[PDB]
Ligand SMILES: Cc1cc2nc3c(=O)[nH]c(=O)nc-3n(C[C@H](O)[C@H](O)[C@H](O)COP(=O)(O)O)c2cc1C
């Protein structure tokens with residue numbers, strides 16, 4: 001019954017960004033992005049496919065989650081980090097990124113799934129709540 | 134390159150519940166659920182597959198989103214509702230449900246994708262913020 005087209009529709013219905021990246025040395029390049037990722041980042045699939053997602057950090061590269069992400073990937077572990085990210089138009093947003101390793105039928109190829117949740121509203125709500133409390 | 138297994142892994146990596154339901158008269162019965170849905174609801178895939186998701190409402194059935202959901206489905210429109218839902222152990226949670234119609238190669242069969250986001254923390258954060266403001 002269920003087919004690849006239906007799973008594709010499921011992935012494109014996600015409110016969170018969903019991507020797959022493939023390890024290419026020190027890069028992990030996008031090989032799949034869903035519609036939510038395009039909307040969240042302001043980049044179209046064609047203009048960022050086969051790039052490392054670190055472009056979302058812009059010039060804001062002094063972020064502690066980077067080293068933990070690299071280490072988790074190297075050790076084949078999942079990880080989750082809240083990162084400062086920037087859309088194509090430069091607008092800032094808080095990105096709660098969840099990275100999961102993938103088991104494939106080709107172990108020589110190493111893939112990671114990324115889930116991007118825009119947590120900007122939640123961060124601001126926590127900030128006001130701390131300011132009033 | 135990309136295959137159904139990888140899309141399956143993507144769907145199972147989602148933090149939000151992702152399901153597909155098929156119209157069966159006045160019911161729309163689950164034909165696919167991901168791991169997040171099982172965790173969010175406390176039900177395993179085998180015990181709720183081919184059931185209508187309205188079981189998540191428990192005995193709390195006087196909910197305004199129901200009529201709007203039925204109308205959107207009947208008209209082939211997407212919809213989004215925040216519902217009071219209940220896990221298998223009875224614990225309550227706020228469920229922001231996004232329903233999307235599906236285009237299939239068999240138009241006689243009518244499918245809907247459901248995305249379930251647990252918004253309980255966000256609702257409580259909005260409540261405290263209104264109480265202090
Ligand atoms: C699947 C996947 C998705 C990623 N998504 C993002 C993202 O949305 N935003 C971001 O800033 N970094 C993201 N990254 C992390 C960067 O691609 C990169 O791994 C990170 O910045 C650490 O490596 P670096 O220090 O060499 O840049 C993602 C990584 C992977 C593997």
Ligand SMILES: Cc1cc2nc3c(=O)[nH]c(=O)nc-3n(C[C@H](O)[C@H](O)[C@H](O)COP(=O)(O)O)c2cc1C
Pocket residue numbers: 152153154159161185186187189190199200202203216217218228230232245246247248249
């Ligand atoms: C794909 C899909 C997912 C749904 N997920 C939920 C859910 O998580 N929680 C819920 O309370 N209702 C959910 N519903 C709605 C119920 O299945 C049902 O359509 C709703 O209660 C309105 O119909 P009724 O008034 O006959 O119950 C979902 C419906 C669809 C089509």
